[PDB]
């Protein structure tokens, strides 16, 4: 807990808002885990931290889960039982079921701020970071229509040096041409780092996942045991059951 104590008194005397979080040990703790202990580091992804929910009201100021409740019931999201051979947290979203005549980006990109908020709250994941796949299957124009470069930088910024938890793979699988223009957009806001870390299988990928997520799949992308839908419905149920912790840390 080397740190804590530093980067407190610093959050005090540049005047962090005392705002719906308390300075906690655990609350900063999530910070210096992040960046290994090294204060300095840990100091830039706190006020970073503030800075991008100062920004994006839309997306971060109600955590409340019912606004998005519908795309959880869609089946957009879930995360795994059990965590990857190096100890991730493995989180899934599929694009077939973000229909985005009914939910906006900021509403999609809502879903992904509720699920880093309750799992950052797990130190084995605040050590071993996360990974997501992203099904880009059934991915349209009407997608990409709601992808703006405001978007694309905002995405940017919480995979690299605005939130509190370490992404340690993302995969992209059944990602179609037409997607490339989007990923465009975002790369050349992305770090080296990051930029190696993202595997883009292509059409073809059972193979290569199932090589890095070995007997902890869903049976849709070559698992044994459970389904997609399985692991959708107990994460909704999890996410509703935390409505107010999620209510506490909102507004
Ligand atoms: C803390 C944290 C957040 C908040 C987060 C993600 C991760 C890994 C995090 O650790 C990944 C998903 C994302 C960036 C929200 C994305 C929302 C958009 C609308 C999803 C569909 C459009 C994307 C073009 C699809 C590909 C995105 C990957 C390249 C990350 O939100």
New binding site residues.
Partial sequence: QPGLAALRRRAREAGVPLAPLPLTDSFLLRFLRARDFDLDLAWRLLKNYYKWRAECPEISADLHPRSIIGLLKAGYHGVLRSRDPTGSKV?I?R?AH?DPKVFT?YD??RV??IT?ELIVQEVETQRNG?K?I?D?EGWQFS?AF??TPS??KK?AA??TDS?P?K?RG?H?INEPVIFHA??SM?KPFLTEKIKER?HMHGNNYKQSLLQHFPDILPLEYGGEEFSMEDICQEWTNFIMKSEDYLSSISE
């Fill in positions: 989180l979203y694009i973000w980006a999609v990109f992904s701020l880093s996360i997501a992203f880009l997608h709601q992808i978007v694309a995405i919480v995979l939130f938890l992404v993302i992209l989007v990923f975002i993202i």
